Design a protein around this nucleic acid. Structure first.
Ligand SMILES: Cc1cn([C@H]2CC[C@@H](COP(=O)(O)OP(=O)(O)OP(=O)(O)O)O2)c(=O)[nH]c1=O
Ligand SMILES: [Mg+2]
Ligand code: NA
Length: 361
DNA sequence: AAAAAT
């Protein structure tokens, strides 16, 4: 009954009602393992397979249900077969018991710790965070110190009442210095997610001067420092150049923060909870972009990561276009394509518009 | 420095 399924996430509608979580959770574990081991192509195969299954409006209950579904190779179909058999993946279970996997997941869960540092610590014989933190020869970056100091709060995922409380704080701070500014919550929460590892925002101003737009993130973070809310701050100045071709991280001015979010600012509706210290450390990402690039930045920062990947792949292989967070370039017409909305980008790409809550690829 | 942060 269902229409042909595209190999591209940007040509699929993926809502949060996942009927194939048994399969997807196992494929996500297998993808994450090849990623920490730096096997791009094998991880890529599991990510694409996981992504297609998330788009299905029904659960896979037999191998005949896998017919006509793209991105399901022989290796992926044997994993599906094993899960149909007893409800569990022996392959994912072996990864979960692997010493490298456990250590890499554990070490990279620390803010300021990436693949290189996790690898360094694993090859040194470390297996637990307790032994890393208490070691006398190791030296930590200021990001890693914050990562270890606020670890429990940061490893606890942010919920919607918390994200909304942060949105109010961001909007009140930004409107203080730029009353004409547009503040949009991006990331997972824009896609309708109930949790996240952080909260993301896109800030833009139609009438700000070059200086007002450069100074805004400094004014907002200083305002929070004065109030004692800024636990961690790292502001990356713009490396954005208007005429370079779109050919990881974008070049806009941005900041990676840890905010002290007072529980009193959260409208939780939840009762029976224990207040403890009365606040929670929340990872917050702010992006400032020039007004004319607002649609590309919004598309880039809304995600999901797989939706973004397939958008760029589709643009390259199907349209001979170059897309990133700053622009869209048409290699045939030899012209940069302008957009005032996400809808105009989809139209330029010849794609049916996919709503933010349908981008959960 | 490389590395981290989306
Ligand atoms: C890191 C990363 C991110 N992106 C885009 C797409 C998403 C946004 C926000 O990032 P995030 O990981 O928090 O995403 P989010 O979906 O909000 O996930 P969480 O709920 O926080 O886990 O950035 C990307 O294109 N490539 C990447 O490698
Ligand atoms: Mg996020
Ligand atoms: Na990390």
């Amino acid at each position: 009954a269902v229409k042909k399924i595209s190999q591209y996430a940007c040509q699929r509608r993926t809502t949060l009602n996942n009927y194939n979580q048994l399969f997807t959770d196992a494929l996500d574990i297998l993808a994450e393992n090849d990623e920490l081991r730096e096997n791009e192509g094998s991880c890529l195969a599991f990510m694409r397979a996981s992504s297609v299954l998330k788009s299905l409006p029904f659960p896979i209950t037999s191998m005949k249900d896998t017919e006509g579904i793209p991105c399901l190779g022989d290796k992926v179909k044997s994993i599906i077969e094993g899960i149909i058999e007893d409800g569990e993946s022996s392959e994912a279970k072996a990864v979960l018991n692997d010493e490298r996997y456990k250590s890499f997941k554990l070490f990279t869960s620390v803010f300021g710790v990436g693949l290189k540092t996790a690898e360094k610590w694993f090859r040194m014989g470390f297996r637990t965070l307790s032994k890393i933190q208490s070691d006398k020869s190791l030296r930590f970056t200021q990001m890693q110190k914050a990562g270890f100091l606020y670890y429990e709060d940061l490893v606890s995922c942010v919920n919607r009442p918390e994200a909304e409380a942060v949105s109010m704080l961001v909007k009140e701070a930004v409107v203080t210095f730029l009353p004409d500014a547009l503040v949009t919550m991006t990331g997972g929460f824009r896609r309708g997610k109930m949790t996240g590892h952080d909260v993301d925002f896109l800030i833009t101003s139609p009438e700000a001067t070059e200086d007002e737009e450069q100074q805004l993130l400094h004014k907002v973070t200083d305002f929070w420092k004065q109030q004692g809310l800024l636990l961690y701050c790292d502001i990356l100045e713009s490396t954005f150049e208007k005429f370079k071709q779109p050919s990881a991280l974008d070049h806009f001015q941005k900041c990676f923060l840890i905010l002290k979010l007072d529980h009193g600012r959260v409208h939780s509706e939840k009762s029976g909870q224990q207040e403890g210290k009365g606040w929670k450390a929340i990872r917050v990402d702010l992006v400032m972009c020039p007004y004319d690039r607002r649609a590309f930045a919004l598309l880039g920062w809304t995600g999901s990561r797989q939706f973004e990947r397939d958008l760029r792949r589709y643009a390259t292989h199907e349209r001979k276009m170059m897309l990133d967070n700053h622009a869209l370039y048409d290699r045939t017409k030899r012209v940069f394509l302008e957009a005032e909305s996400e809808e105009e980008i989809f139209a330029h790409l010849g794609l049916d518009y996919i709503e933010p809550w349908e981008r959960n690829a």
